[PDB]
Amino acid sequence: EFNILLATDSYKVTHYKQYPPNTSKVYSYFECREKKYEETVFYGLQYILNKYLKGKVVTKEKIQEAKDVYKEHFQDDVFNEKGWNYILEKYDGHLPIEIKAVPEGFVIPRGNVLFTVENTDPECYWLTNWIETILVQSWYPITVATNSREQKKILAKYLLETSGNLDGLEYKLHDFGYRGVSSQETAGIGASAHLVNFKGTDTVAGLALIKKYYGTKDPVPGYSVPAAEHSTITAWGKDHEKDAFEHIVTQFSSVPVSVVSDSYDIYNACEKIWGEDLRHLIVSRSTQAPLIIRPDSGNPLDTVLKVLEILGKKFPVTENSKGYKLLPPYLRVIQGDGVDINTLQEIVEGMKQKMWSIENIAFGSGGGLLQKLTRDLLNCSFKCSYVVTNGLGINVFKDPVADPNKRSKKGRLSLHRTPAGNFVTLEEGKGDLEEYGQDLLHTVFKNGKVTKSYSFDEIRKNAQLNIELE
Amino acid sequence: EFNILLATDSYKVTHYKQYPPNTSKVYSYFECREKKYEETVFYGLQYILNKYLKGKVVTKEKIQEAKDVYKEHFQDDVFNEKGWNYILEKYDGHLPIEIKAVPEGFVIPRGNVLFTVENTDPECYWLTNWIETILVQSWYPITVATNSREQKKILAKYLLETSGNLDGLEYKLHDFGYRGVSSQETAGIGASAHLVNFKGTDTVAGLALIKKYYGTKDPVPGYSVPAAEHSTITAWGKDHEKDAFEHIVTQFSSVPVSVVSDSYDIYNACEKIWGEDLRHLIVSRSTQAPLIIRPDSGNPLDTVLKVLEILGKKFPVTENSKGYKLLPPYLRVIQGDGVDINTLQEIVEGMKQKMWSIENIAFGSGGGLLQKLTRDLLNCSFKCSYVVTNGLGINVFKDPVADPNKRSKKGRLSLHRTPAGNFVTLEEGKGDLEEYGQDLLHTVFKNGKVTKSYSFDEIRKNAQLNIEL
Ligand SMILES: O=C(Nc1ccc(S(=O)(=O)c2ccccc2)cc1)[C@H]1C[C@@H]1c1cccnc1
Ligand SMILES: O=C(Nc1ccc(S(=O)(=O)c2ccccc2)cc1)[C@H]1C[C@@H]1c1cccnc1
């Protein structure tokens, strides 16, 4: 049983006493602050609104629970029981909050307003920033989606250059991150964010999240293929690696199958086992059911190049119309160890220099894709920009002397199209002057209700690469 | 509804068809593989056992749900319906698995077995590694607890050197990480792991997790203090920072209060606002209710030093018995921006060089504490080491030619004390020889039941520093 009264930074419990007396409005906004990663994919707020913020989120029992916990946590009675009771009695426990946001999947340059939050009842001035902590966690799906998309750009560039098209791009980066994230909930959120850009995942948790909170026309948003792990190879015993390989490809003879080949000696496995002993079982496979050889150790670039070199001498290689080398359609490789945005770039460039097409390879990423990310990558941040005290609106901001990068925006904000079709954020309520057309933010939450939402299909469309559109 | 049949890496769905025929046993183990972080705090498994693995975790509906999902996910009917129905019918949906583990809170050197997993029914040979994915997520609380403990060692060293004792050590690193982690669940898990070592947190989610899954004799495991955020200062308007400060310290006049002081000019705030305009409201405060000044920007070391330099000119400073400078007891500082294990070390060393006692300062850490950590920090890994096929036990392992660091252990494992009091993991069932005393692994889970549990108090005792001991 989630309790929103216990889902904030502890100090926020004490803030209702700290604002100027007679403050009736607190207005705040979220941005990926300007400071690589010049544009961000806005994704994940809809999950948060539906799972945690909407409907009756306050009850008598939840208030009492919070009261009891904070009494001990602070060793003092500081909890705003009266404020929460007001929301319970007046609004049947629905949050008197209005949130405006850019559409999910939108790709927006750094330093723009992405969403705004304000209270709709003057008694609830303190509520706007109470929910900062939970809303700021949107940094995570934003960052996964953005970093995943940047990797897609790299793959698109190199696939296009070495093959002349983008066929299969959406399957070139596979999510291996389930075991490497910090929790089950994180796994679902992170996997869903990756699926904004790609269709391949082994993080099953992502599927149910998308189905529940976003929705797709297709039965599922993401797909996988049969594959071995080291245990299904090593269990056969060291002297029987060939027997394991034979059993596995025979069990999965009519569908694609990935077989990890580095349990003892990746180079021996490729040259002698796959390349000689079991070659007859590989060359007989359909192009719809390739063997995918999976190295999993050593220097990622060096290993990929040597594996390709070996396979190229054991199997018939062709030269595509761009002049790049291509394995036969029944044989592919996946590199799924040590892949992050940096090593991904290094590998595809190294392959290009050695005249190997990117068609030959797919990538798996686990820790790099879903865990090795923090809120400071895109500087995702929530700040108060406008208050009303004694009936007077005041534009407020921080501006630390030692770090101009931490300066925050002033006043009421709105997002607009510029004459050249770019994005601009207007401060100080200047959007009201109507010199930049209509505000692009939409009301997505109001008084306990979700007022606008997006399907996962819409989100994917919004997040497309320019080259995909082109 | 959580569904264990949908809580694994997709490929594991296909593994029941890949093991050698006639395999009746798959036995696997978890270690923080050897390759800085020489010892790890084992913490978090009990949460996973209770929340996800115990009791009736298989139902008719869950099997059908998984069948339907995997049919579309694989575009093929590969799911092991028979195997899961067997567990449902035979064991009322309880997992026929035995897990043995080192006690939670134990501090164990890298490269040792921390827990093992095996099937208790030959039909369920495939189940051992089905649950690898969910169990391996224990890397996270282990890593948070370990990294938090390592920072405690640094703090202990410098607090001892500059003050002669360890008073208040357990409040020197405060958890600010709630907003900076990836989910609500991660927040609770991570916060609870930090509380193995310290008592200060603003990540409230940690308290509920501890109360539900571990338990403490005290009402709560962690505590906080009133504090401002930038919004409660900036809301007063730029020209009224002083009014904000005055209002806040007066509202919280008899309890500790932290006030963020860098909204516009941290140095002006310290020298002119706190140091002159409002000095009378500070020097009158109780030692049990100090003002804690919070910088939040700039180079962390340079800023801390300059803040201390400023305050030392405006407030009466003493010299402790170790020769280090000490602010009056109604005034302290917290650095809570950009703190991680590396910068923490830099700050305390810099303070020591400038003759400032660590008594003067506490640290807050958010992203560095709970989010900027990965599974490869401690190389937390789950591997199969033993199987029985055709009634014969076989010791199995991986040993990749290009990376000896990824070699895994062979056979049945056990953990023991060495004659010198250290730890050793015995391989190949050699623990059976009884030459190394009792196995330190205890059965914690068997056939759907949690069989051994630890309180959070016990875990804290196990995880104590030597210096504390
Ligand atoms: O290699 C694996 N899967 C896998 C392999 C290849 C691809 S692929 O090349 O994109 C692909 C996709 C669709 C059809 C054919 C090939 C997609 C997934 C799994 C063993 C690896 C894995 C899964 C989970 C966690 N860690 C590693
Ligand atoms: O400074 C803050 N709290 C805080 C300040 C000082 C300490 S302390 O110095 O360890 C301490 C502990 C116990 C009693 C008295 C003082 C402990 C916590 C909160 C504003 C900062 C915060 C909280 C949450 C997220 N981000 C920043």
UniProtKB/Swiss-Prot annotation, chain A:
User: Where on the tree of life does the source sit, at the highest rank?
Assistant: Eukaryota
Task: Please tell me whether the keyword Cytoplasm is annotated for this protein.
Answer: yes
| The protein's annotated pathway | Cofactor biosynthesis; NAD(+) biosynthesis; nicotinamide D-ribonucleotide from 5-phospho-alpha-D-ribose 1-diphosphate and nicotinamide: step 1/1
Q: What is the effect of changing R294D?
A: Reduces activity towards nicotinamide
What InterPro entries does its record include? Aldolase_TIM, DUF5598, N/Namide_PRibTrfase, Nicotinamide_PRibTrfase, Nicotinate_pribotase-like_C
What influences the activity of this protein, per its activity regulation comment?
A: Inhibited by FK866. FK866 competes for the same binding site as nicotinamide, but due to its very low dissociation rate, it is essentially an irreversible inhibitor.
- Chain residues that bind beta-nicotinamide D-ribonucleotide: D202, R294, P295, D296, G336, D337, G367, R375
| Positions bearing Phosphotyrosine | Y171
So where does diphosphate get bound?
R179, H230, R294
Please give the Pfam families that the UniProt record associates with this protein: NAMPT_N (PF18127), NAPRTase (PF04095)
Q: Name one GO molecular function term.
A: identical protein binding
What the protein does comes down to: Catalyzes the condensation of nicotinamide with 5-phosphoribosyl-1-pyrophosphate to yield nicotinamide mononucleotide, an intermediate in the biosynthesis of NAD. It is the rate limiting component in the mammalian NAD biosynthesis pathway. The secreted form behaves both as a cytokine with immunomodulating properties and an adipokine with anti-diabetic properties, it has no enzymatic activity, partly because of lack of activation by ATP, which has a low level in extracellular space and plasma. Plays a role in the modulation of circadian clock function.
Report the NCBIfam families cross-referenced here: PRK09198.1 (NF006629)
Protein's recorded name: Nicotinamide phosphoribosyltransferase
Origin species: Homo sapiens
Name of the coding gene: NAMPT
Curated annotation (Swiss-Prot), chain B:
- Where diphosphate binds, per the record, is at R179, H230, R294
Q: Which Gene3D superfamilies match?
A: Aldolase class I (3.20.20.70)
Q: Which CDD domains match?
A: PBEF_like
> Which Gene Ontology MF annotations are present?
cytokine activity; identical protein binding; nicotinamide phosphoribosyltransferase activity
Give the pathway annotation. Cofactor biosynthesis; NAD(+) biosynthesis; nicotinamide D-ribonucleotide from 5-phospho-alpha-D-ribose 1-diphosphate and nicotinamide: step 1/1
> Which body tissues produce this protein?
Expressed in large amounts in bone marrow, liver tissue, and muscle. Also present in heart, placenta, lung, and kidney tissues.
Q: What is the effect of changing R294D?
A: Reduces activity towards nicotinamide
Signal peptide residues are: none
Q: Which residues carry this modification: Phosphoserine?
A: S455
What is its biological role? Catalyzes the condensation of nicotinamide with 5-phosphoribosyl-1-pyrophosphate to yield nicotinamide mononucleotide, an intermediate in the biosynthesis of NAD. It is the rate limiting component in the mammalian NAD biosynthesis pathway. The secreted form behaves both as a cytokine with immunomodulating properties and an adipokine with anti-diabetic properties, it has no enzymatic activity, partly because of lack of activation by ATP, which has a low level in extracellular space and plasma. Plays a role in the modulation of circadian clock function.
Question: What assembly does the database describe for this protein?
Answer: Homodimer.
* Name this polypeptide is given: Nicotinamide phosphoribosyltransferase
**From which source organism is this entry?**
Homo sapiens
List the gene name: NAMPT
